[PDB]
Amino acid sequence: SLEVAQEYRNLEFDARGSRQTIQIDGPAEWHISTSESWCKSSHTIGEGKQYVNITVEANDTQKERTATVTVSASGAPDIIINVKQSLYSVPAYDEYIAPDNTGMRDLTSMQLSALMKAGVNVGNTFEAVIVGNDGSLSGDETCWGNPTPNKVLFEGIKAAGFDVVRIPVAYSHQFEDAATYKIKSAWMDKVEAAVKAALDAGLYVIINIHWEGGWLNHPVDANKEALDERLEAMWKQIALRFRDYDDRLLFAGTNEVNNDDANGAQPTEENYRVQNGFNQVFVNTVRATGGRNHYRHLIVQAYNTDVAKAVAHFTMPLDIVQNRIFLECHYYDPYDFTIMPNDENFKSQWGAAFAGGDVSATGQEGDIEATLSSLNVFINNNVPVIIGEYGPTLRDQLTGEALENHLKSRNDYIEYVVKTCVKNKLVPLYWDAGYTEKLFDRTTGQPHNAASIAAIMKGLNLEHHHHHH
């Protein structure tokens, strides 16, 4: 005697990966199979009265799909359960407007990436926050020592040969209502004015929600509901403000998501699940606004923006349009050369020219090639990759031979990273924080470090002009 309750005969799943426990009331021996690889039973063979899980993979096909689950036993009729899984759909927002392709070229993110080429960050600016010991946030875009981004800065960036600017942004120091995460319109106006100036200068523009005190750095189930709700509430506002901008404006959902409570522990499967979930929340929220945001190119982040973690653990969000998502990683290897503080055991030199000198034990040419080339798995899957930040600090306290060798090392490193990105079809964005590493004078937009700008341009053009077999 083989029995399955009527409630279990016709199962329905949404597009997410998910599971449902059913009950099989069977004899001493029974069996289960399914008709499709995306629909799995926890059990192949069973006995008696058992809780059995039916699990579906995420449906990224943009069509409804169906399967059967067949329960069988010797001398008993088969019981055949229907499984239906829906296509991906966006949350319903009252503010939704119909999709609009005005200014939205018919280009995949991969194709767009090939036009973007290289760029720079306007770092330590709109994301600058004064952080108190209780996590309280204050300040504005000038609080880390930079002036407001202006027209002449963006014009200078474009004139030097850059085609993209990443503008990190903080918002959580500018709430009108903290409980609902309502952002002051006056702050949004300032952000928008900078975006407009950058676009008018002829640049691609990327805006994000950056670190801003680290509130997002709790990728655990205990905090997922609150964090997902906040990330949505914030992105809904930003997406609505910027909805009518053309395809030169891209959104990046998060920055460097980490578990701030785990003290550098290896991340867990829970951490990857919840962090990949943040990327999904961001995509859902933007798409749910409709208009040009239906088509906008969106940028989602690897865990910690780490390359190896991208390769091992990043999952593509489900989306309502095809091929309009980029992956973002950051790249600062070797850390003891690039960004380790001056009061720690830094290495001032880098690369083959300084082998046997004050160089790092890792992150020389071969290591850089290995790590950046590992991103080929994305490129070959038609997923473009932005290296959203790279670059070494400039240790201006050094003197004599040590300073000269350091300055050379920075430029050798910069050129090498850039050329390696180009070879691998990655888009490299230099970390300019307006301090000693800066490329431009923030006030006038004039070049500050012509030699380092030239290193980037040499890296960009190396294999085009000076090519060989």
Curated annotation (Swiss-Prot):
It is an enzyme of class 3 (hydrolase). GO terms for biological process: symbiotic process benefiting host; xyloglucan catabolic process. CDD domains: BACON. The keyword Cell inner membrane does not apply. It catalyses: xyloglucan + H2O = xyloglucan oligosaccharides. PROSITE patterns: PROKAR_LIPOPROTEIN. The active site is at residues 256, 389. Belongs to the glycosyl hydrolase 5 (cellulase A) family. The BACON domain was initially thought to act as a carbohydrate-binding domain. However, it does not bind carbohydrates and may rather be required to distance the catalytic module from the cell surface and confer additional mobility to the catalytic domain for attack of the polysaccharide. Catalyzes endohydrolysis of 1,4-beta-D-glucosidic linkages in xyloglucan with retention of the beta-configuration of the glycosyl residues in xyloglucan degradation. Cleaves the backbone of the 3 major types of natural xyloglucans (seed galactoxyloglucan from tamarind kernel, dicot fucogalactoxyloglucan from lettuce leaves, and solanaceous arabinogalactoxyloglucan from tomato fruit), to produce xyloglucan oligosaccharides. Gut bacteria supply the human body with energy from dietary polysaccharides through glycosidases that are absent in the human genome. Xyloglucans are a ubiquitous family of highly branched plant cell wall polysaccharides present in the vegetables we consume. Enzymes involved in xyloglucan degradation mediate the conversion of otherwise indigestible plant polysaccharides to short-chain fatty acids. This is Xyloglucan-specific endo-beta-1,4-glucanase BoGH5A.
